[PDB]
Write a protein that holds these residues in place. Structure first.
Motif: not given
Lengths: 120, 120, 120, 120
Positions: A48, A50, A61, A63, A65, A72, A74, B26, B47-50, B60-63
Motif C-alpha cells: 500500500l 502513495i 513510497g 509499505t 506487509h 515490514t 518500506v 491498514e 499518511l497511509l500504511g500497514i 509497521f510502515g507508512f508513507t
C-alpha cells in the motif's frame, strides 16, 4: 507521465503488481519477493502506498506487509522516463524486523536499494 | 498490546494522528511535520500504511505524501509497550526528494530516526 | 570549537576513546560496544577516522573493525557545541555483516543512529 | 584473497586508489568522485579505512574527507570473489553534510550504494 500501475520486476528478480492509482495518488498491489530471511516461507504479500500525481517523474513510497513473517519493508523512490520513453523506478528500502523488546531495537533495521523496470 | 491508533509526537516536535486500523492492519492519518526543507511552506500531509495485527508489539510502515513539496517520506518501526503500559514507536525513515533525472538519483535519499510517544 | 578527542558514551551505553587528532584530521581510538549479535563475545575494537579541522562543529567519519566478528561498522556525524560548552556527537551508522556471496548482499547492511556525550 | 590495495571505479564513474593494507587491515588512499553537491569544486580527496585480514571475502569500511566541502562520507561493504576470480566491492554509504546547529541535524545525512570493480 509515470503511473506505478502495472507489473514491475527488480534487479534481484522480485515482482510486484500495482493496481489503479487514485486521484490522491494512493495505490495497492502485491509483491512477490525473490529473497527473504527464510525463503522457504515466501508468500505473495500486500503493498500500500502513495505517489505524487501532478509530476511527470513522481516520487512515491509504499509499505509491504510480509504475509509470512513479522517484518515490514518500506520502499521510496522516483519514477524516471528516458529520452526513449522507458520507465525506471529507482528505490531505496528499509526492512524492519520484529525484536523482543526495546533493548534489541538497535539491530532491527536493514537498508538497501532496488531498481525496477516494467515486466512488459 | 501496543496500538498505533491515536495522536503522537516525536522527538523533533512533529505530530501525527493515526485513524482506525482495519482487519488487514491498514491505516490512514495526518502528519504535521515540525521540520522541512522550506518550513514556511509546511501544510498537513496524509499518511497511509500497514501494521501487523496479531503481534503485541507490531512492526509497521507508512508513507507520507508531503502536500507542500514533491518529496515523499517512508517510516518503518515497531511499537513497544513497557511494564507500565507506556508506548513508544521506534522508527527509521527515508526522505526521497525529486531530482531531474537518473544521473542525480545518488543524492535523492536522506535517512534518519524518530521516536514517537502518545499525546495524552 | 567542538573536539572529538576524549572519552564518550552513547545512548545505548557503548563507550569509545578517541586519541589525538592530527593536522589532517585523522584519529584512532578504541570502541567498547554495549550491544552485539553475540554480546558474550564482545572485545575492545579499534577505530580509525577523519574529521574536518577548521570547522568549529566538524563533520567526521570513522570505521570500527570489530575484533570479535567478521563485521564492520562505519559512523558519520557532526560535533555540536551548545551555549554552555556541552558537546554532542550526532551520528548515523551502517553495520556491515559478512555474507557468503553476492546473492546475499541485499541483507548485509543494518542502519541506525547514536548520540554520544562526553564522559566526565 | 581480497585486498583493497589497487585502483577501483564505481558504477557512477568515481575512481579510488588504495595503498598497501597493513597487518591490522588499515589502509589509506585517494578518492576522485564523479558527483558532488557542487561538482565544479571537486578535488581529489583522502580516504582512510580498515578491512578484515583473515577472511578471503572481507568486510571493510572507510571515511572520505572531502577536500572541497565541509561534508564527510563513509562507505562500508564486502569484497566478493567470483568463480572466475573477479572481484567486486558491494558498498553502501552515508554522506554527512555540515549544518549550522543541532536543530538542522535531521536533514544532514544522505544514504546510497555503489558497486566497485578494479580499473585493470
Amino acid at each position: 507521465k509515470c503511473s506505478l500501475t502495472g507489473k514491475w520486476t527488480n534487479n534481484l528478480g522480485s515482482i510486484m503488481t500495482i493496481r489503479a492509482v487514485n486521484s490522491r495518488g494512493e495505490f495497492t498491489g502485491t509483491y512477490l519477493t525473490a529473497v527473504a530471511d527464510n525463503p522457504g516461507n515466501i508468500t505473495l504479500s500486500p503493498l500500500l502506498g502513495i505517489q505524487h500525481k501532478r509530476a511527470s517523474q513522481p516520487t512515491f513510497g509504499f509499505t509491504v506487509h510480509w504475509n509470512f513473517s513479522e517484518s515490514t519493508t518500506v520502499f521510496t523512490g522516483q519514477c524516471f522516463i528516458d529520452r526513449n520513453g522507458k520507465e525506471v523506478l529507482k528505490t531505496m528500502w528499509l526492512l524492519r524486523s520484529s525484536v523482543n523488546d526495546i533493548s534489541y531495537d538497535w539491530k532491527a533495521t536493514r537498508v538497501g536499494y532496488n531498481n525496477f523496470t516494467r515486466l512488459s
